[PDB]
From a paper:
At the molecular level, ASH1L is a large, ~3000 amino acid protein that contains a catalytic SET domain responsible for the transfer of a methyl group from the S-adenosyl methionine (SAM) cofactor to the lysine substrate. While ASH1L represents an attractive drug target, developing ASH1L inhibitors is challenging, as the catalytic SET domain adapts an inactive conformation with autoinhibitory loop blocking the access to the active site. At the molecular level, ASH1L maintains the H3K36me2 mark, which enables the recruitment of the MLL1 protein complex to chromatin to activate target gene expression in leukemia cells. The crystal structures of ASH1L-inhibitor complexes reveal compound binding to the autoinhibitory loop region in the SET domain.
By combining both substituents we synthesized compound 5 (AS-5), which exhibited low micromolar activity (IC50 = 4.0 μM). We then used isothermal titration calorimetry (ITC) to quantify the binding affinity of AS-5 to ASH1L SET and obtained 1:1 stoichiometry and Kd of 6.2 μM, which is consistent with the inhibitory activity for this compound. To further characterize the binding of ASH1L inhibitors we crystallized the ASH1L SET domain in complex with AS-5. Crystals of the wild-type SET domain diffracted to a low resolution (~3 Å), precluding detailed structural analysis. The ASH1L-AS-5 structure revealed that the compound binds to a predominantly buried site formed by residues from the autoinhibitory loop and the C-terminus of the SET domain and is restricted at the bottom by the SAM co-factor. This site is lined by the hydrophobic portions of the side chains of H2193, Y2255, S2259, V2262, and I2279, the polar groups from the side chains of N2256, N2261, and Q2266, and the SAM co-factor. An interesting feature of the binding site on ASH1L is the presence of multiple backbone carbonyls from S2259, C2159, H2193, N2256, F2260, K2264, and G2280, most of which are involved in the interactions with AS-5. Overall, the crystal structure shows high shape complementarity of AS-5 to the binding site in the ASH1L SET domain. The thioamide group of AS-5 is deeply inserted into the pocket in ASH1L and is engaged in a network of high-quality interactions, including two hydrogen bonds with carbonyl groups of C2195 and F2260, Fig. 3b, c. The binding of AS-5 to this region induces relatively small conformational changes and suggests that AS-5 exploits conformational heterogeneity in the ASH1L SET domain rather than inducing large conformational changes upon binding to the protein.
Residue numbers in the entry: 2063 to 2281
The structure:
Amino acid sequence: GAMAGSYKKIRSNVYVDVKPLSGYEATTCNCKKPDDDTRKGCVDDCLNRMIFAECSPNTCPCGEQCCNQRIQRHEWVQCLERFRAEEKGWGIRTKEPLKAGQFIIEYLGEVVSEQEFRNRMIEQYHNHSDHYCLNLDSGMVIDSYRMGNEARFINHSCDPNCEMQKWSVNGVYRIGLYALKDMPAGTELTYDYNFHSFNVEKAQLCKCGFEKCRGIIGG
Ligand SMILES: C[S@@+](CC[C@H](N)C(=O)[O-])C[C@H]1O[C@@H](n2cnc3c(N)ncnc32)[C@H](O)[C@@H]1O
Ligand SMILES: NCc1ccc2c(-c3cccc(C(N)=S)c3)cn(CCO)c2c1
Ligand SMILES: [Zn+2]
Ligand SMILES: [Zn+2]
Ligand SMILES: [Zn+2]
């Protein structure tokens, strides 16, 4: 098949004409730092975790034992591979097993208004046969058509094994990919564009293979 599409790889979102402020209060929780030097704190019941807020630097009661700073510490899995996914161009798969709920990778790109993006669609993206636009917040999107990271190659499934979650990370919304279920080695990562992706209003046949496939992506 064809070569993978070109993009400018970035390590952090680029803010173009909007900045995705979360409006969250300063983060606080009631977690206690485990006396064991090597046990994690801020686990499932962390009051910050429960509102999709990451703990902030210097103020978490667990200190360096806090495990609720995954996005801000860029704690991405290191076992991802870009590969030819049959009938779906390029996709991303994991080379190691993943566990339900686990953080995988941040989705990066240019953060733009829906106005700027609809402008880019008419002027720059009208010829494209692959689309790269994630929803973020009211009126803003993450455009990875030109800059981003390898999460831009993750394909859609009507029966997805991953999902996007929107988190407040030190006052700004960021989007991460998280596993919905345990997945064995070699599994292609997928998420449901109907739930997470901007409606580019293009009809493309879905090849996810699900018994109850929606027929087209986002349908
Ligand atoms: C975010 S890109 C994913 C990477 C893309 N496959 C590539 O080769 O660059 C989304 C594009 O991938 C293709 N795609 C994603 N999921 C698909 C699916 N389930 N069935 C067919 N094509 C899919 C569509 O062309 C879609 O516009
Ligand atoms: N229902 C909401 C919704 C969500 C996403 C889409 C898409 C779509 C297709 C390919 C790529 C992308 C990306 N943003 S990457 C989005 C098309 N449509 C209309 C046709 O169904 C959608 C509708
Ligand atoms: Zn906590
Ligand atoms: Zn914490
Ligand atoms: Zn499908």
